[PDB]
Amino acid sequence: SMYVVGHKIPDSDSICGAIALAYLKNQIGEPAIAARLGELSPETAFILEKFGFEAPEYKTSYAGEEVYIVDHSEITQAPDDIAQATIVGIVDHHKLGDLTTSTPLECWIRPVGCSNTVIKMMYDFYQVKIPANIAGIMMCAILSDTVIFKSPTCTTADIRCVEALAEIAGVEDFKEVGMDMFKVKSAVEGTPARDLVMRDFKDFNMNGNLVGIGQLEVIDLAVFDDIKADLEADIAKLKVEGNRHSVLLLLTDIMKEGSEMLVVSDSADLTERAYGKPTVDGRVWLDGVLSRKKQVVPALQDAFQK
Ligand SMILES: [Ca+2]
Ligand SMILES: [Mn+2]
Ligand SMILES: [Mn+2]
């Protein structure tokens, strides 16, 4: 069988996409097993529970196996031993990264806000009906990725596809299911600082400099008030533990549609150079900022070249 698998530190898109593409492949006689490279966030765990699904199989070694990649095309986000596997498919909505194959494959890549939007196109192409349970987690993955359409990564294709999936899943109020997800993401009390920093954390090599960026998306930025000092202490620790130039944590308020960024950097004027807004006691408010890959990373990469 093939293993359908998303990126290291799986998000809803990577997990819901794996289940959604595995089902499709099994229905068209191309045997497939959903898999993951890490634990589910409470967000993803809630989505699976609500629509009645088991987590994909936890699997880290793929040497000698067939692999269908979801929601990236990067070596670093792939399984450690991806070079010893055979990539038979990629479905994604990112820039084309450094993954390569020695064998013919499928690529379904589109400039949209969510892999699950593309996977919906795959069902239509194959003329396989989307079961109500699958439609719902597919829906939720797109609301997760596009932040209920508020993220500037949201495209026309994502909106029309959610509207389509909502009817198939018999969800009347897709926006209420979206807010239900971000409420679960907003329940941060009692969670160790490190679990929160690493929930959605990525390392970047920006012109020789190692820059780590976490992000939490919540309904109200006030939930972080009592734990914020523990966060600032833990991003200092983590900067040392990895010998990082910079560790930044995005606290993203999806109602104000902005991000408070906690900063520890070897560069004192980092946020002044990249965004034209300086940090004040290792903190800066970034109005309108929702997306790491669109509004945060480009401007940092530009400042490490300059
Ligand atoms: Ca390539
Ligand atoms: Mn993702
Ligand atoms: Mn995605």
Residue numbers in the entry: 2 to 307
Task: Recite the paper's sentences.
The crystal structure of Mn-Sh-PPase in the absence of substrate was determined at 2.2 Å resolution. The M1 and M2 sites showed similar coordination spheres to other family II PPases. The M1 site in Mn-Sh-PPase was coordinated with one nitrogen of histidine, two oxygens of aspartates (D12 and D72), and a bridged water. Additionally, the M1 site was bound with an extra water molecule. Coordination geometry of the M2 site in Mn-Sh-PPase was also similar with that of Bs-PPase and Sg-PPase with 5-coordinated bipyramidal geometry. However, the distances of a bridged water in the Sh-PPase from M1 and M2 (3.0 and 2.4 Å, respectively) were considerably longer compared with crystal structures of other di-Mn enzymes. In addition to the Mn-O distance, the Mn-Mn distance of Sh-PPase was also longer than arginase and catalase. A unique structural feature of Mn-Sh-PPase found in the present X-ray analysis is the longer distance between bridged water and two Mn atoms compared with that in other family II PPases. Our observations reveal that the di-Mn centre of Mn-Sh-PPase in both single crystal and solution forms has longer distance with bridged water. This suggests that the active site of Mn-Sh-PPase has an intrinsically ‘loose’ structure.
Inorganic pyrophosphatase (PPase) catalyses the hydrolysis reaction of inorganic pyrophosphate (PPi) to two inorganic phosphates (Pi) and plays an essential role for living organisms. We previously reported the expression and purification of family II PPase from the psychrophilic Shewanella sp. AS-11 (Sh-PPase) isolated from shellfish living in the Southern Ocean (Antarctic Ocean). Sh-PPase activated by Mn2+ ions (Mn-Sh-PPase) displayed the highest activity at 5 °C, which is characteristic of cold-adapted enzymes. X-ray crystallography and EPR spectroscopy were used to investigate a cold-adapted family II Sh-PPase from a psychrophilic bacterium that lives in the Southern Ocean.
